[PDB]
Amino acid sequence: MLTDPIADMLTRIRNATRVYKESTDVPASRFKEEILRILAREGFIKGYERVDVDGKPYLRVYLKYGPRRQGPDPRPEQVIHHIRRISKPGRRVYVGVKEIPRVRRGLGIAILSTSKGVLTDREARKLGVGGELICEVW
Amino acid sequence: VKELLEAGVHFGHERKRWNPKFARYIYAERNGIHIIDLQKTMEELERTFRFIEDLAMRGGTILFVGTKKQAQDIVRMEAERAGMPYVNQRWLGGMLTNFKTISQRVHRLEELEALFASPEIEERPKKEQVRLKHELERLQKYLSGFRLLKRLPDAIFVVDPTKEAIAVREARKLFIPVIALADTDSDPDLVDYIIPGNDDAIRSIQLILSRAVDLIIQARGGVVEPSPSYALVQ
RNA sequence: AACCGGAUUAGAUACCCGGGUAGUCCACGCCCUAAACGAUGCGCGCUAGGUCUCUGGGUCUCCUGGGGGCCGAAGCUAACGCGU
RNA sequence: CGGUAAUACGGAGGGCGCGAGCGUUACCCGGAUUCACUGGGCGUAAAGGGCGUGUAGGCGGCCUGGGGCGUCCCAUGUGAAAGACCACGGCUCAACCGUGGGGGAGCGUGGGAUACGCUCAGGCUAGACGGUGGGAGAGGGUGGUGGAAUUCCCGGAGUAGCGGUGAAA
Ligand SMILES: [Mg+2]
Ligand SMILES: [Mg+2]
Ligand SMILES: [Mg+2]
Ligand SMILES: [Mg+2]
Ligand SMILES: [Mg+2]
């Protein structure tokens, strides 16, 4: 049926970015929109925007890459190196402010859903809340 | 005088022998053939001839490589209509990467120049006056434009890049930029500077490859005529 | 199959030859195993292409489905390979 | 390791390591991400059930609203002493000892958040199912029927072998 929408998305982005595509549709939800803002705000993507495709709501996603590169294999470095579900339908992961992960001594995100709303780790830490630990990007 | 001379007989090439990486530089598949977008040839051309002009005016060295049917001869002309090195018959294994070694061929070819002009112009146990004088045929036939190259080149300019990808391979291996005329045969992403065109039409190969050799001297004055290149253009 | 003979062989409870019961076939009822093999559980979403082919549909060079093959981007794999 | 040149056995000299000890055996955690929550795997290495149907169970699309069980936050209670930890003392040092400090999950209680998961109410149509029209097929069950071949029986004609093997019987 489509068991995890959030993961599907996290993956559509993993997959597209690895053949250096410019854009990617994902079928649209509010919670999906949210994660994308944090993604955009921390400059892992250029951004997103709604659309309609065959009568139906998608969110186009504008990926972003490094500069073309030197020697044999000139493929760019990649702005999103690592994106990964953590809470999952078959095993939900919840953490309190005291146990929030510090992805990659600082250089990394951990998107994280709380009662104050969807938030990065430092956001959440400073707001002092924890929650369902959605995923991590670096 | 470009623009119209491009769509002369030099625009679109092959069909379904294609690389999808080349999808951006195509106008359309009409008639079952691929017809390549000219506007984007021009765009790519400036960016390419800029690289060329600058390398030249800083007094560089572009190594030319065309070993295919229709390039073969127009290359040894425009190479020397520019005093630049070329490879023409056979790209050898490590011209760039075993360079120091492939170079002791040139080293020892013109050690024979020093016995075609010698007190040995008519003597030496006379079955060496072929063995040697016929060894200088291999050396002749191949190291014609490679003999002038004395330190690794500054660019390389390829005619068909998929045809000649064992060169390109080594270029990148040494960070030597790669300028190529490319078409739908080919994979852009490892051409450093791209002339998206027809790899095949002799009209095309000529139109382009020569006009690049305007620049190479017109970055130093004394530009010549329409130049010796219409081999049997018909 | 078994078995009864003819051979061959150092022997030949075998391979080769001549016969031959159960069985192989049909009805009904049991057994429930296999290199029961794609040695690859089922479902869904995503990620270049080329080529051959079965069956649909369209505006029928070809396009759009559903199946069957090979080659192979990215990636994967100890490797061999797998690769819409 | 040892079969006449043994740094591997036994003694010598010498050397290395610990030292009032040094070795040995047993048992525990370790290294062992070798039961893999952190942290593993299954085409050919150990490993996909012979196939379906579907019971319980696990899991569950887009939008809105109510509840606040999951989840998060703040207070507060509990969390004995000893131990562990950081200090500062006392036996000439230390071992030992003492004084003081600092923490903590888990659980009760009061208050709060509602993004996610749950639940309740209502909505959508991209999942699933149905309608209509059309298609290919050695998919299954029942009855029936057709021709080529072998074997047997009757008839004609007809004669000395046939069959079988590597060769034969
Ligand atoms: Mg028999
Ligand atoms: Mg363990
Ligand atoms: Mg199976
Ligand atoms: Mg089922
Ligand atoms: Mg003291």
UniProtKB/Swiss-Prot annotation, chain A:
GO BP: any one term: translation
One Gene Ontology cellular component: ribosome
Pfam family, one: Ribosomal_S8
PANTHER family: 40S RIBOSOMAL PROTEIN S15A
Task of the protein: One of the primary rRNA binding proteins, it binds directly to 16S rRNA where it helps nucleate assembly of the platform of the 30S subunit central domain. The combined cluster of proteins S8, S12 and S17 appears to hold together the shoulder and platform of the 30S subunit.
Stated family: Belongs to the universal ribosomal protein uS8 family.
Protein name: Small ribosomal subunit protein uS8
Protein encoded by which gene: rpsH
Curated annotation (Swiss-Prot), chain B:
Single GO MF annotation: structural constituent of ribosome
GO cellular component annotations of the record: cytosolic small ribosomal subunit
Record protein name field: Small ribosomal subunit protein uS2
Coiled-coil intervals: 98-143
Assigned protein family: Belongs to the universal ribosomal protein uS2 family.
Source species: Thermus thermophilus (strain ATCC 27634 / DSM 579 / HB8)
SUPFAM superfamilies: Ribosomal protein S2
Subunit structure: Part of the 30S ribosomal subunit. Contacts protein S8 and may contact the N-terminus of Era.
One BP annotation, GO: translation
Upper classification of the organism: Bacteria, Thermotogati, Deinococcota, Deinococci, Thermales
HAMAP family assigned: Ribosomal_uS2_B
Highest taxon listed in the record's lineage: Bacteria
Keywords of this entry: Coiled coil, Ribonucleoprotein, Ribosomal protein, RNA-binding, rRNA-binding
Leader peptide range in chain numbering: none
Function as written in the Swiss-Prot or TrEMBL entry: Spans the head-body hinge region of the 30S subunit. Is loosely associated with the 30S subunit.
InterPro entries membership: Ribosomal_uS2, Ribosomal_uS2_bac/mit/plastid, Ribosomal_uS2_CS, Ribosomal_uS2_flav_dom_sf
